[PDB]
Amino acid sequence: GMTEYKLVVVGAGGVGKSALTIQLIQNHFVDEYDPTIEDSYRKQVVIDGETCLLDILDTAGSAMRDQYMRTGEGFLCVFAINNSKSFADINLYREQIKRVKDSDDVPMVLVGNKCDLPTRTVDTKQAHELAKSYGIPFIETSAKTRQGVEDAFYTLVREIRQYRMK
């Protein structure tokens, strides 16, 4: 059969969860996507010559939250490079996912979004060290320019693929 990967995009409000997801799906940049919108997609894609079903959930910032954390197989942990609080929040999101999953090994990718912006308050060295501390990849993205957007989602799929063989 066809392989299925449930991906969940998490992160503080305004970091670009929706802009990243809409860029992936629509190849369009959204300026004003309502912050209450939770949008989920079932889409067939080809990654590394293997076709799979991606179930992608763009979260909006309690019983339902634990529900989509239980169901999610890999998590895009998004922060914005001009928002130090969103970067500091990553460890809280990570801990909460592991708590809900009741598992210490959850596939994740660290995403630093809005890299097109001049205002940078998160040092890339600290983003690299945070990803290193977690043992996960770190990808710099711009949903405005589409830089790294496909890489971020496809990398998470590859991480789930490796997790399933362990």
Footprint of ligand GDP (CB under 6 A):
11, 13-19, 31, 33, 35, 113-114, 116-117, 142-144
Q: Report the alpha-carbon distance of residue 97 to residue 90 in Å, rounded.
A: 11
- Diameter of the chain by CA atoms? 46
* String marking each residue 88-117 x if it binds Mg ion according to CB under 5 A: ------------------------------
Closest CA to 73 of 165, 159, 138: 159
31 is a contact residue toward Mg ion (CB under 5 A): yes
Q: Which residues carry a binding-site annotation for GTP?
A: 11-19, 30-31, 113-116
Q: What is the H or E stretch that residue 52 is in? A: strand 50-58
Question: Which range touches Mg ion (CB under 5 A), out of 17-25, 39-47, 80-88, 153-161?
Answer: 17-25
Spell out the residues 6+ positions from residue 116 whose beta carbon is closer than 8 angstroms to its own.
Answer: 142, 144, 145, 147
If the CB atoms of residues 15 and 52 are measured against ligand GDP, the closer one turns out to be: 15
**Judged by CB under 5 A, does residue 18 bind Mg ion?**
yes
